[PDB]
Every structure is written in structure tokens, then in C-alpha cells.
Design a protein around this ligand. Structure first.
Ligand code: K
Ligand code: K
Ligand code: K
Ligand code: K
Ligand code: K
Ligand code: K
Ligand code: K
Ligand code: K
Ligand code: K
Ligand code: K
Ligand code: K
Ligand code: K
Ligand code: K
Ligand code: K
Ligand code: K
Ligand code: K
Ligand code: K
Ligand code: K
Ligand code: K
Ligand code: K
Ligand code: K
Ligand code: K
Ligand code: K
Ligand code: K
Ligand code: K
Ligand code: K
Ligand code: K
Ligand code: MG
Ligand code: MG
Ligand code: MG
Ligand code: MG
Ligand code: MG
Ligand code: MG
Ligand code: MG
Ligand code: MG
Ligand code: MG
Ligand code: MG
Ligand code: MG
Ligand code: MG
Ligand code: MG
Ligand code: MG
Ligand code: MG
Ligand code: ZN
Lengths: 245, 114, 53, 91, 68
RNA sequence: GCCAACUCAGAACUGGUACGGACAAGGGGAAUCCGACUGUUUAAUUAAAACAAAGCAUUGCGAUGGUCCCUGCGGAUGUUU
RNA sequence: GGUAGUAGCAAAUAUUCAAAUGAGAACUUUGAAGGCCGAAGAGGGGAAAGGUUCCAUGUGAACGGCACUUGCACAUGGGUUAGUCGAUCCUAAGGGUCGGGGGAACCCCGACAGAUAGCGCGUUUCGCGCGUACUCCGAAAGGGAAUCGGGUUAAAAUUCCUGAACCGGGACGUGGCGGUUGACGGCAACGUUAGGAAGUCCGGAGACGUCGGCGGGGGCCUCGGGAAGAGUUAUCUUUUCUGUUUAACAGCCUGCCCACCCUGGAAACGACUCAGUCGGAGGUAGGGUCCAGCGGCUGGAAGAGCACCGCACGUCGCGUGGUGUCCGGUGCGCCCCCGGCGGCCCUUGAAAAUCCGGAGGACCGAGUGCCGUCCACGCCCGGUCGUACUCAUAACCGCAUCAGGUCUCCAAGGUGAACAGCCUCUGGUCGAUGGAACAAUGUAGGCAAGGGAAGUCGGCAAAAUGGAUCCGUAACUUCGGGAAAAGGAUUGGCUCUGAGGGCUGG
RNA sequence: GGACCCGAAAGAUGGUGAACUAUGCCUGAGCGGGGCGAAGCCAGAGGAAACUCUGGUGGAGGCCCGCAGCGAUACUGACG
């Protein structure tokens, strides 16, 4: 008869993201004439740590195309980039790690990261540490390109979408065991209030479908409907299968 | 062994509530407020301190409070860039311009040949 | 002011400097707590390095 | 004297977390706290600042690398693949 | 407070309009001449008493003089 | 030559064997059950073998999306991938 | 009403003697003695909260669980002084909003559906150029313009008095500085009180976690000598005790640990820290620049404060005079600040106001006066509100003058590893209604011959062990532990011996 | 219909509290003295070599004894 924890997540106010010390969103430059037709040079000024994010971020300074001022940007750092390196963004940029190129100019089999979904969205795919996308094939007829996402899914995107050559830096982070609850506490302290987690069978019936009973047990199949209403949809949602491979 | 009390209505030992113990001509100890330690100007290229400028609070650098010689360095980018950084910038500018001229003349010669 | 003399403390200091009241029955802290070996090592290093210089 | 037979750096954990986990984390503990060769200045002065960030104490260059090593294994393969593709395109 | 190291500068300071009073203090080893101006009190230290007497004689007539 | 500090280690002598003289300050050992451990919990009868935990495994989801809040409009995750 | 003058007044070691006042004194005041708090206090201040409880005089009744001459009660009066301490300013998590979108409507979302506020230059006050939809609230602990001694009240003070400084703003005058129109010096790091400049642009400070070692500074503690006063003196004691001071601010000097510059070119590698580390990307070495200072000297400033010794009025001179305030040592000592390294992170540990600097050079002046000038001196002004007091075993909350609860600053000597326990100095205090007796039963604290868990559901409770030094330490084990395993020996006082250092001088 | 008088556990509607407590966020503050001795580093010994060993230095840990702080196991003590 009580709202369950998963339901209470949506309202927020204690489950909102912790973003006080973050350095701002990481994204490409806004797509403009120079990047659409030629190339624009930038210089990496700093590689910084973004709290709550495994991948490091790189500060890049560009010369504004038509204003007398500096154009400052914050890119997701690709492995191998360094302070003082020159970064080239555009259709005519060379195929080197760190450069941002339109997918039409990236040959098949290349390794890219922070791939745009819509032309000009400034990067949504393959952004986490150690992740990358692979260019599969190009379709000149309809101006679309096929890529392989980190999850293994194959997606078709317009060939005008941009991507950064190389893989995201910071790879191999998750292979290290934490060994203790304190490390997880520190990890999630900067992400959101999602830890520790209480098992549903440890609760009373009033606050979870798994609650209750003189023994700890679910008492009914943990696989639930895709259309099950909130508060009832707990456990393995719309599972096509369960158990080991 | 005289024991002291805060001179102001601040009752917590924060960074801005620092003090020193001074002996007055009256023979008694007393607190006196001391400003927080501040880092002086720093060179963004090398990250090291800028020589010739004292380390004061930002308001202590005001023109009406500090002499001009104390807050200036007689060189291009004086007080902003270190000497080595300025030298590197000058050399880089000169050499890059020279290489630009070399590229232009090479392109002109190649065009003439063809 | 009420009398609180230091004469006994000074006499005890003299006796200690003569080596009195320093036996195993007069020690409560460990040898480390009484005098850390780190302090002795630092002293020896400073002395020997100064002599070498 | 040989202070530990085999523990080495993981001796700080005492008898906690299990032998297998200590052995597994020993590799990361050694690698992330070690010095790495700097290509730019030719010195063994590259130290990890934060996960994925590696700065050189000598020349001051900062590089984005692996979480616990300066260069991940896949980084070299990615560089080789990109070089091959660039050479094919240029040719 | 500021110290004047020359009798000439001391006389120059005493001659200006905003000099209010002059105070003379007799110490064992020297004589101190103090001039009260708008912003600062200027003190001149004279080691020899003969030159101190000459300076006292040389004080402008219109400046008040007090002995300490 | 002039100064300097308290640490350590020995040797005599000596007291009614007292002497960490008050104070201060582990009892120890051989096994069984449970929980790995540190941590947390029923404010005012239960501190535990209960909760959490690192580790292990499963499920949904590539944004025209997964989960969730909202009368509606719109929102949290999301400065995210 | 009976209960009943009954249950009770029992935690926080403790009072005693003489005198004064008073009708009345175990409870008020003075002096003496004996004790306690024992610097992570029963001491000295603040934040919140309270609101006059603060100070003086007086006091019938009530109240202060006995009493009162008394008082945090009652009555009459008095008391809170700021350009410098705060609010005020900035922004944090967030709050409140325009427009727009919803909504029967109270209202909901909140810069997201949009002709933003405005900001600079010259002026016939009009022109030109920039202009991304909140210029609002939000910290008496975050950021931040400026004050210090000395003195003063019954009760206020960094606010009042005296003296001496500083900050912000405004306007001019004098002098100085530049014109090679926009200074000079140094090879350099950089130095000098001055020493062009508009739209535009750029950097820095503000500005940041935690732990460990080391080093510097200020205060405290501590040892010795000189002088001043006091305590002991049957005996000894050149001995015991007290105090022997120097603020903001201005100038000059100095120059920690780093950082930087010049000469030079290194293996027989060297330099170097407690630990590290550094060097042909230029070490060692020699010579320099800069940075901190809560460092030194001087002015302030001895005229002040303190201590001591005198003269005088002797009812009301807040009177008058002298002497001194000196010279050294020491440190894993304690509090605070700073410097520089190192460890830790799948944790990397605010923003803005504000201030400083820089890139560029449109534009700008004269010949005995003009144009500039962040230089020195001179002149004027600085609003509003808070400010008493308590901050707690009676001034807040807990129905109370309740052994509970309530954030924080300072922190002496001895023993001892030690803000452990125990004793002491400054400061505070003897406030817990008193008297007599010492039955049972209780509460709290001990001891007990022989036996040693036979008691009990159960070793509950108590006892035993305990610090430090030396010897020694099993099974098992994830090799990290177990471990202080277990098991043995020693410990006082006195008189000595040995070892472990610094400065100066060829 | 209040229906002789007094009485429910409940139900509905509309408002008020996070000064206690629970959790997230922002900004401040606080935490003796000792024990064990991980990485890194210095030196020496043994050995044909491989390599092994010894003595120092250093100070890691959701490590240990323990003061303050925080909490509350037993006496099933006192009080009740
Ligand atoms: K419900
Ligand atoms: K949580
Ligand atoms: K769980
Ligand atoms: K169940
Ligand atoms: K189960
Ligand atoms: K300067
Ligand atoms: K613990
Ligand atoms: K536990
Ligand atoms: K427990
Ligand atoms: K559990
Ligand atoms: K969504
Ligand atoms: K009376
Ligand atoms: K509307
Ligand atoms: K809005
Ligand atoms: K403030
Ligand atoms: K004053
Ligand atoms: K801050
Ligand atoms: K650090
Ligand atoms: K000051
Ligand atoms: K300029
Ligand atoms: K006041
Ligand atoms: K208060
Ligand atoms: K028994
Ligand atoms: K039994
Ligand atoms: K009826
Ligand atoms: K509260
Ligand atoms: K907090
Ligand atoms: Mg189960
Ligand atoms: Mg000690
Ligand atoms: Mg809807
Ligand atoms: Mg304390
Ligand atoms: Mg009173
Ligand atoms: Mg509207
Ligand atoms: Mg404003
Ligand atoms: Mg530590
Ligand atoms: Mg001492
Ligand atoms: Mg005097
Ligand atoms: Mg210029
Ligand atoms: Mg009330
Ligand atoms: Mg001691
Ligand atoms: Mg609250
Ligand atoms: Mg314990
Ligand atoms: Zn390098």
C-alpha cells in the first residue's frame, strides 16, 4: 500500500544527479561552415578529471571563425591525446586520433568515439571510458553510414554526422575490484543517491511485491510484463529468458 | 598564562577568522586579525610564480594602495607571462612567420615551374 | 599569589641528569614513546653528513 | 631484508577481501603507481594524476591514457589501424 | 609617523602652513623634535645638544613650541 | 678553548624481597554454530545469526528509447550514452 | 475529608572561628582557617534562543519546595554612542518570477514557445558602435575596502576620551615628472616614488580535499645572571615567590624553503633529503634576481604601562617627585600561522562580486608656453540598523531555579607515553534545608580462616591479569596473520662508569 | 428525524507541520598518546652463476590498544 523505491525515483528531490563539481557538458563544436567545408584547428590546453565520469575531458581552444575572440570547447578525451596537441575538426581534417571528422570522410573499419546521431547534435554515441564505435559501410545513394555501437548493435546514421577518431581514454577502469563498500560509497557519492541497495525480499509487503513471508523468497515469478503498471513492474522486466547462458 | 578571547562576534575557527598573539605595551596579550595567505600572480604557461610582485589579497593590489613599480614588470607581457615563456613565444612567432614565407615562395616556385 | 615553588622540580631535574630515577621501574612508555628511533636516526644522519661536508 | 614473501604492495590490505581479489588488484596497484617513459622528453617521469590522466613531472606534458596504465593494449592496435587507413586514403 | 633624517628637511617641513605645533623632548642621549602636520607626525633626532639648541633658535616665530 | 640535552647500557653499595609501592592498566587455553571482514538497525524491553557490503549472476534499454513522476502542461535519470 | 504532620528533604568530598549590621543570623557582609573545580574547568568569551534577566537604591505581602537582614522576586530610577566590529555587497544548494504552456479556479512548470535589460564614444541631446530573455531573494561560520595602543563607567566601548593611523569618494592648488609626443638603469632574472591613450581582446588573484615527515616565524612553557620588592630564617638556604612591557601604522635592512638569471661544460659520475630527488632539456661550482615573514633597527615611544622608594591634603588637590624596566641559554616541548616534499582516490575535493596585469594603438602638443601625468604635499565628506546581559547543575528547551538536552574559541606546573588518572598555580567556589543518634531492612564501597563453582538455567556479580625492559612463543593460515599466543625473568633508593653533540681558532 | 441521556474501533472533506527524527544537496567546524610495520630507498654477506640472505631507512591500512567525540553490551544494578 506504499509507493515503492523505484516509483519514488521519478519524482526526484533526493535522486537527482549530483553535478555541483562537474565541468559542464562535453560536446563537439556547433556545426558551422568551416567544419562543413574545410577544417578548423584547435589546441588542447588541458586534460581534466570530470567527477562522476570515468573518461577524462580535454579543454580545446579554437580561433573563432568570424569574431575576434577565443572559442573554448570541452571534448571527451580520446586515448593518446596530450596538452599542446593540435586538433583538426572538419570534413577535410586528416584521419588522425583526436581529429573530429564527418563520417563520410572516415574509411570503413575506423575506430571512432562520440558519434553524432543527428547531424549537428555534437555527439551522443560511444562516450564512456574505453568505448568506441566502428564504421562498417557507407551508402552513397541515401547518404547514410552504418556503425557498430559498443553494445554490438548496428545503427544507420546520416553520413554528415561527426565523430572523433580513436577510442575514449580511461579504458579498463571496471576491471579493478573495489574490495570494500567505502569505494562504492565514494564512487556513487558524486553520481546520485542509488547506493546501497536493499533487496526487495528484505522489505515488508507494504513497500514491495517481494516483501513479506516467514521465509525470504519472492513467492512468484520474478519476470514481469512489459505493460505491468508502475509499482508492480519489479524484478526481471520483460525477460526473454533467464539463468545462465 | 593569560588566556584569550575573540575580539569580534565570530566564534568559529574558520579560514577568515585567523589571528596572532601580540604583546601590547600594557603588558597583556591580545589577538589581532591576520589576512589569509594568498598566492601571487602565476604564469599560465609554466605554472610558476611571476617574479617581482608581492603575494597579497586582491584588494591590496589596488592602485590607490600599492605603488606602480610593485605591481608591474618592465617587459612585454610583464606580470602575466614569465620571461622564458615570453622568449619562447617570440622565437615561435619569428620562426613560424619565416616558415610561412618559405612555404609561400616554394609554392610560387612550383607554380612557375609547372 | 599563593606559593607554588619550582625548587622540587629543579632538584628532581638535577637528580635525573645525574642518572637517578631512570630504572626499569620508573618507565611507563615504550622506548619509542620515550625517544623515537626516527629522531635518533635523523640526528645521526645530520651529524655525519655535516662532518663529511 | 625480504619483508613479504609474495604480498608486496597488497600487504596494506592485511588479511581482508580474499587472496584472489588481492592478487587481482595487485596488477592495478603496481601499474597505476609506477613511473612511465615520457616520449616527449625521454624521461621516466610520467605519473598518474587521476584515472586516465598521466602527467610528466619533467616537461609538464599531460596525456590521456588508460585507467591504470599509460597505454592500453587496444590503443596501439587503434593507432596501427588508423595509420593503415590514413595511408590507404593518402595513396 | 615618519622620521626626518636631515635638519634641512625638518625646517622645510616646519615652514609649511599645515604645521600645527612643534614638540621638543629631552632624552638622555639625544633630543627629539616633533612636528604635527595634517597627515603625519615628523620626528627629527639630533644626537648633539648644541645643534638641538641652534635648531630650537631657528624655529619659525609663528610655530608653537612645547617642551617635553 | 667555550657551551649544550636527555636518552641508552653497565658496576658497586643499601633497605623487614620493598620497588609499574597511589594512580594508571589484557585473564589465558582446546573446540562447536552463525555471519567473511570494517559498517548499519527496532529514539523508550530485542544490537543479533537481522540490514548493508565488496564479489557473483540475471533482466530492460541505441534517445521516435529503458525505468519513473505528473490532473494537465511538462519533468527525474540527464552537465547522462 | 481520612490518608497525614505521614512518604519524603540523602548524587556533584566541607565546613569552622571572630567581628559588623539587624527585632530576628547555620544561610547577609568583612577577615582568618580548612577543602573542592584542576586549563577537553565549577575559569575567561561568543553563535542560536531569551528580552531587561544588566547597574544603583529601597522593600510591606507573595515567590526563591528550611530560612533570610537577602534576590535572576518586588518598587523607583539609570544604562547599549562605530566611515574601520557586523548586517549591508557577492554568489552556493536552492527560492521567487516576466513571457509562453496548462488550469473551472485557488493555482501548476519555471528564462523551457520571446522585438532582454541595457552598455560605451562623441554631442546641434542627437548620432555612432556593441548588445545569447531575470541587473530579483538566498551565508551575523563561504568570498569580502579600512584602526591601533593607553585611559575611562555603578552599569558601554577596536563605538566614549587622548594620541597616533588607515579606507572609499569629490574637487581643485603648489611642486615634481615626460615630449626623441609618451622616463631611466641592468647582459639577465629584474630595479626605480612618476613616466600616453579609446572601442576590442587575453591572463592571473579571489580559488579551495585529506593524511604523514621535515623546516621557519609569533605566543606560551623552561634554565642562568643583574637589579627591585616580598616569603622562610630553633637550623640550612648568594636560596623560595612576583614582575622585569612595547600596538596599528611609515621608512630602511634582511632575504628562510622554493622559483628564476649570468659564466662554464660534467663518468673515476657527481650533488643531495628524515624520506625523497636533480643534472648536456646544462649538475657540481662561482656570482646574482625575486618571493614570505607573526624577522631586525628606527619613528610611533616612554611622555605610556608596570614595579619599587619618598613628600603632601590628612574632611572633597583624579596631588606632587625620583629609581628600573637589563644580559644570555635551551628544546622530537605545547597553541597558532607559514614553507616545501611525499602518500591516497573507479572520491580530484564551489561560484560570483571585486581587484591587478597584459595584447593592440584609432586619437592626441607645444616653444616659452601647450598637452599629459597611477608622483608628493595641501583641502572637504563619509548614511541606515544591531551593540546592556545570560549562554547555562537557576537568564535557551524539557509544564520548574529539573543530576537530562543544546554549536564553538583560549588552555599553566608536577608525575607520567599522554588535553589518561592523581596533586597544584591564575580564576572561581564551599550553592545543594540544618541538628542528634549510629537499631533492623536497604543503597554504594571493602575484607574474610579451610575448600574453590559443590551455588546458579547459565561463573550473573566479584576476583584474578594488567605498565615498561629482556628471553620465548604452537596448531592453523587466504602467507597478510594468529601474536600481547602460550610460557619465564626484572623493576626502589644511593654512589658512580661508558656511549651518543654544537660554536670558535690554522 | 440528534429522538430518553452519555459512549466506539472507523469513514469523508479541507488545511498545518522535516525547531525531533529519516534521506539527498550547499557551506563551515572537530577527532590525545601508543602498537603492528606494506610499497619505495641505502648498505653489507653467501654463491661458479642463477639468485638468496642480513641490517637499516620509510610510514601504507574502511589495521590494533586507547583519550575527546559518537554510541549503548551487562548488572536483567539504582530509580521505578
Ligand atoms: K499508496
Ligand atoms: K543512500
Ligand atoms: K542488498
Ligand atoms: K515474499
Ligand atoms: K531467498
Ligand atoms: K616589480
Ligand atoms: K572499525
Ligand atoms: K561489524
Ligand atoms: K552489537
Ligand atoms: K545481510
Ligand atoms: K527518457
Ligand atoms: K534588617
Ligand atoms: K494560461
Ligand atoms: K520561467
Ligand atoms: K558574510
Ligand atoms: K584609542
Ligand atoms: K570556499
Ligand atoms: K596532497
Ligand atoms: K591593521
Ligand atoms: K595598454
Ligand atoms: K557593546
Ligand atoms: K549567544
Ligand atoms: K557451576
Ligand atoms: K541445568
Ligand atoms: K422519539
Ligand atoms: K533543524
Ligand atoms: K556538513
Ligand atoms: Mg535467503
Ligand atoms: Mg612520546
Ligand atoms: Mg501528460
Ligand atoms: Mg582543547
Ligand atoms: Mg542585579
Ligand atoms: Mg503569465
Ligand atoms: Mg546584485
Ligand atoms: Mg593515514
Ligand atoms: Mg616546559
Ligand atoms: Mg616612566
Ligand atoms: Mg601599450
Ligand atoms: Mg512551551
Ligand atoms: Mg616526562
Ligand atoms: Mg533539519
Ligand atoms: Mg577494543
Ligand atoms: Zn616529459
Amino acid at each position: 500500500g506504499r509507493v515503492i523505491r523505484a516509483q519514488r525515483k521519478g519524482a526526484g528531490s533526493v535522486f537527482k544527479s549530483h553535478t555541483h563539481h562537474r565541468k559542464g557538458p562535453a560536446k563537439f563544436r556547433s556545426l558551422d561552415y568551416g567544419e562543413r567545408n574545410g577544417y578548423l584547428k584547435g589546441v588542447v590546453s588541458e586534460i581534466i578529471h570530470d567527477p562522476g565520469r570515468g573518461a577524462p575531458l580535454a579543454r580545446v581552444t579554437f580561433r573563432h571563425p568570424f569574431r575576434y575572440k577565443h572559442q573554448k570547447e570541452l571534448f571527451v578525451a580520446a586515448e593518446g591525446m596530450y596538452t599542446g596537441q593540435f586538433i583538426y575538426c572538419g570534413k577535410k581534417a586528416n584521419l588522425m586520433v583526436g581529429n573530429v571528422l564527418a563520417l563520410r570522410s572516415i574509411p570503413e573499419g575506423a575506430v571512432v568515439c562520440n558519434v553524432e546521431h543527428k547531424v549537428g547534435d555534437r555527439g551522443v554515441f560511444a562516450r564512456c571510458s574505453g568505448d568506441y564505435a566502428i564504421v562498417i559501410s557507407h551508402n552513397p545513394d541515401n547518404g547514410t553510414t552504418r556503425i557498430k555501437l559498443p553494445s554490438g548493435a548496428k545503427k544507420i546514421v546520416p553520413s554528415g554526422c561527426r565523430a572523433m577518431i580513436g577510442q575514449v581514454a580511461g579504458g579498463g577502469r571496471t576491471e579493478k575490484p573495489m574490495l570494500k563498500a567505502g569505494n562504492a560509497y565514494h564512487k556513487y557519492r558524486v553520481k546520485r543517491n542509488c547506493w546501497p541497495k536493499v533487496r526487495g525480499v528484505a522489505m515488508n509487503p507494504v513497500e514491495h511485491p517481494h516483501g513479506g513471508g516467514n521465509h525470504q523468497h519472492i513467492g512468484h515469478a520474478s519476470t514481469v510484463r512489459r505493460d505491468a503498471p508502475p509499482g508492480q513492474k519489479v524484478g526481471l522486466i520483460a525477460a526473454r529468458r533467464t539463468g545462465r547462458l | 598564562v593569560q588566556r584569550l578571547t575573540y575580539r569580534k562576534r565570530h566564534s568559529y575557527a574558520t579560514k577568515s577568522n585567523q589571528h596572532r598573539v601580540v604583546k601590547t605595551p600594557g603588558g597583556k596579550l591580545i589577538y589581532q586579525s591576520t589576512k589569509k595567505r594568498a598566492s601571487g600572480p602565476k604564469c599560465p604557461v609554466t605554472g610558476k610564480r611571476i617574479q617581482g610582485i608581492p603575494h597579497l589579497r586582491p584588494t591590496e593590489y589596488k592602485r590607490s594602495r600599492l605603488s606602480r613599480n610593485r605591481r608591474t614588470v618592465n617587459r612585454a607581457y610583464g606580470g602575466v607571462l614569465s620571461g622564458s615563456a615570453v622568449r619562447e613565444r617570440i622565437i615561435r612567432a619569428f620562426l613560424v612567420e619565416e616558415q610561412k614565407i618559405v612555404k609561400k615562395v616554394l609554392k610560387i616556385q612550383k607554380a612557375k615551374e609547372k | 599569589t599563593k606559593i607554588h615553588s619550582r625548587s622540587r622540580a629543579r632538584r628532581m631535574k638535577e637528580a635525573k641528569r645525574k642518572g637517578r630515577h631512570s630504572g626499569y621501574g620508573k618507565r611507563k612508555g615504550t622506548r619509542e614513546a620515550r625517544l623515537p628511533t626516527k629522531v635518533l636516526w635523523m640526528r645521526r644522519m645530520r651529524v655525519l653528513r655535516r662532518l663529511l661536508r | 631484508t625480504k619483508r613479504t614473501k609474495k604480498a608486496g604492495i597488497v600487504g596494506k590490505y592485511g588479511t581482508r577481501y580474499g587472496a584472489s581479489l588481492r592478487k587481482q588488484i595487485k596488477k592495478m596497484e603496481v601499474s597505476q603507481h609506477s613511473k612511465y617513459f615520457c616520449e616527449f622528453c625521454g624521461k621516466y617521469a610520467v605519473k598518474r594524476k587521476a584515472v586516465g590522466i598521466w602527467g610528466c613531472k619533467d616537461c609538464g606534458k599531460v596525456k590521456a591514457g588508460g585507467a591504470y596504465t599509460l597505454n592500453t593494449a587496444s590503443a596501439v592496435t587503434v593507432r596501427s589501424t588508423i595509420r593503415r587507413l590514413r595511408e590507404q586514403t593518402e595513396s | 609617523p615618519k622620521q626626518i633624517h636631515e635638519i634641512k628637511d625638518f625646517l622645510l617641513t616646519a615652514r609649511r602652513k599645515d604645521a600645527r605645533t612643534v614638540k621638543i623632548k629631552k632624552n638622555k642621549d639625544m633630543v627629539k623634535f616633533k612636528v604635527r602636520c595634517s597627515k603625519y607626525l615628523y620626528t627629527l633626532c639630533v644626537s648633539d645638544f648644541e645643534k638641538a639648541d641652534k635648531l630650537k633658535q631657528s624655529l619659525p616665530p609663528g610655530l608653537s613650541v612645547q617642551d617635553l
